[PDB]
């Protein structure tokens, strides 16, 4: 661990016995060349591709306490709450949406609302990520009440969810605890189309071109899940602010918030991801010197389809927090469906 914490790279003697001359291995390792930096890690392209960072940036937007005015002096009136970015899985974005809406006029594909409901309901399937960072000083009570009022209306005004059908069980193989079957799933007989078809014969036949058999849940399971979601949000002033003592608050004792226990630091980042089956992943990261950045995993709830739908149709829904990033992200989710990738790593 002490070796790993420092940087010292040590050449390796050749297993060839004659002289033990160190080999030209060396290595620049653009992930190593990037410490000491502040914002991100320049990566020289292909290196990030071989690292499986399969979430290309899709849209940048800003949550403003008050958007800036051109007319008053210099736009100093502009006060921004957060600076948010979004990302989405590009291989899968090519796989599902590229087989149905690909091959047409891009304008014609985005122009009809079928594609809109597509990008709305198939969002959580892609494992879409939202990375929003702190742009100023933030007390937790303030932004917490803000978030409650923000996700209340999206909790109230939404219909039953539209979910696919689980074709394969995907049991785990405990004795093999790092093996995943999707290579076998695509290369079972080298003709996996027919076996996959006779496999979905049991569950259901897809409703459209890409291969999803939609099932919008009926009357019930549409309020019980929403009631459980409202409950999970009801735990925000309690989980964020348990009791009157910050000494026992979960935020104190680490650099994501100040040592005073009541302000959140600028450069703090929140990552949100949405699994297919209503699962939520949420992480945090205090920014700054890349050499000492601290990542944090907050919680992993499952089954909460209501909050997943709320997040996706709040960021990208009919009435999003800022329609500009919604439009930009939908168009830039169209652009890789032709095959390519934004931030062109080929």
């Amino acid at each position: 661990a002490a070796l790993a914490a420092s940087v010292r790279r040590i050449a390796v003697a050749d297993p060839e016995d004659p002289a033990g001359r160190p080999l030209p291995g060396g290595g620049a390792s653009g992930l190593d060349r990037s410490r000491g930096l502040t914002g991100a890690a320049h990566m020289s392209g292909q290196e990030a591709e071989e690292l499986e960072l399969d979430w290309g940036q899709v849209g940048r937007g800003a949550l403003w306490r008050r958007r800036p005015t051109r007319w008053l002096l210099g736009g100093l009136d502009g006060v921004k709450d957060w600076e948010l970015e979004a990302y989405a899985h590009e291989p899968l974005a090519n796989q599902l949406l590229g087989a149905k809406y690909g091959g047409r006029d891009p304008r014609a594909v985005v122009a009809d609302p079928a594609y809109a409901a597509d990008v709305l309901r198939a969002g959580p399937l892609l494992g879409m990520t939202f990375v929003l960072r702190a742009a100023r000083d933030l007390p937790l009570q303030e932004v917490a009440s803000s978030w409650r009022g923000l996700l209340g209306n999206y909790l109230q005004r939404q219909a039953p969810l539209s979910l696919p059908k689980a074709v394969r069980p995907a049991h785990l193989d405990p004795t093999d605890l790092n093996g995943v079957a999707w290579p076998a799933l695509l290369s079972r007989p080298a003709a996996a189309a027919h076996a996959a078809a006779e496999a979905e014969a049991a569950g259901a036949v897809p409703d459209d071109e890409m291969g999803v058999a939609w099932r919008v849940q009926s009357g019930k399971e549409a309020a019980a899940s929403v009631a459980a979601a409202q409950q999970l949000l009801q735990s925000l002033p309690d989980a964020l602010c348990p009791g009157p003592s910050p000494a026992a608050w979960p935020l104190t004792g680490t650099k994501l918030v100040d040592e005073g226990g009541r302000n959140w630091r600028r450069g703090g980042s929140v990552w949100v991801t949405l699994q297919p089956e209503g699962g939520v992943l949420v992480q945090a990261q205090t920014g700054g010197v890349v050499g000492e950045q601290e990542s944090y995993l907050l919680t992993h709830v499952q089954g909460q389809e209501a909050l997943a739908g709320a997040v996706m149709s709040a960021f990208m829904g009919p009435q999003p927090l800022d329609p500009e990033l919604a439009a930009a992200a939908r168009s830039v989710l169209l652009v890789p469906a032709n095959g390519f990738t934004a931030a062109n790593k080929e």
Partner: protein, 50 residues
């Protein structure tokens, strides 16, 4: 201005050539090509035309 009044023994007013030489050279060719951008980016938005 301070040094000119101390040396010549009188303040340069718009009635004198010293004031106009100072104005033109100093002001117009040293501070104006930048204070112009400052006012074009800070005070003109307040009024009607952007």
């Amino acid at each position: 201005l301070a040094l000119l009044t101390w040396m010549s023994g009188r303040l340069p007013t718009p009635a004198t050539p010293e004031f106009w030489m100072l104005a033109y050279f100093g002001f117009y060719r040293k501070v104006w090509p930048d204070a112009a951008a400052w006012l074009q980016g800070y005070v003109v938005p307040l009024m009607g035309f952007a």
